[PDB]
UniProtKB/Swiss-Prot annotation:
One of its GO terms (cellular component) is tertiary granule lumen. The gene is LYZ. This is Lysozyme C. One of its GO terms (molecular function) is identical protein binding. Disulfide bonds join 6-128, 30-116, 65-81, 77-95. PROSITE patterns: GLYCOSYL_HYDROL_F22_1, GLYCOSYL_HYDROL_F22_2. It is linked to Amyloidosis, hereditary systemic 5: A form of hereditary systemic amyloidosis, a disorder characterized by amyloid deposition in multiple tissues resulting in a wide clinical spectrum. AMYLD5 primarily affects the viscera, and the predominant clinical features are renal dysfunction of varying severity, and intra-abdominal bleeding. Inheritance is autosomal dominant. Residues 1-130 form the C-type lysozyme domain.
Length: 130
């Protein structure tokens, strides 16, 4: 499913992402935008290390979910990577909460540093009523 900006904003707020571990809703919106373009079925194979990024937040199979073919991988979210490809983002959200519970927080995603950090991210939630 490809979410529309404000639709996603409201959904994430209902799932309790606003301010989760110090992370504002607009930061989560900026992250989803740059990681998948708000697309829940987005996948990206990393030939360099044999891992794959799954879903709206492009969560990696080496550390977060299990896909069976990633070498030396753990499954910290205790989920099959298939779960991060559903139109219902409840599981992808639960797993992203798990990711930021680690010391790096939101910084775990390099795309956040490149496109969101220190920027005016207000535009991602403007006019959405959240």
């Amino acid at each position: 499913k490809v979410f529309e900006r404000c639709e996603l904003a409201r959904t994430l707020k209902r799932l309790g992402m606003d301010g989760y571990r110090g992370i504002s809703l607009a930061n989560w919106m900026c992250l989803a935008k740059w990681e998948s373009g708000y697309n829940t079925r987005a996948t990206n194979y990393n030939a360099g290390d044999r891992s794959t990024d799954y879903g709206i937040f492009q969560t990696n199979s080496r550390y977060w979910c299990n896909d069976g073919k990633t070498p030396g991988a753990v499954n910290a979210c205790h989920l099959s990577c298939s779960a991060l490809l559903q139109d219902n983002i409840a599981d992808a959200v639960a797993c992203a909460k798990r990711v930021v519970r680690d010391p790096q927080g939101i910084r775990a995603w390099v795309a956040w540093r490149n496109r969101c950090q220190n920027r005016d991210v207000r535009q991602y939630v403007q006019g959405c009523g959240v």
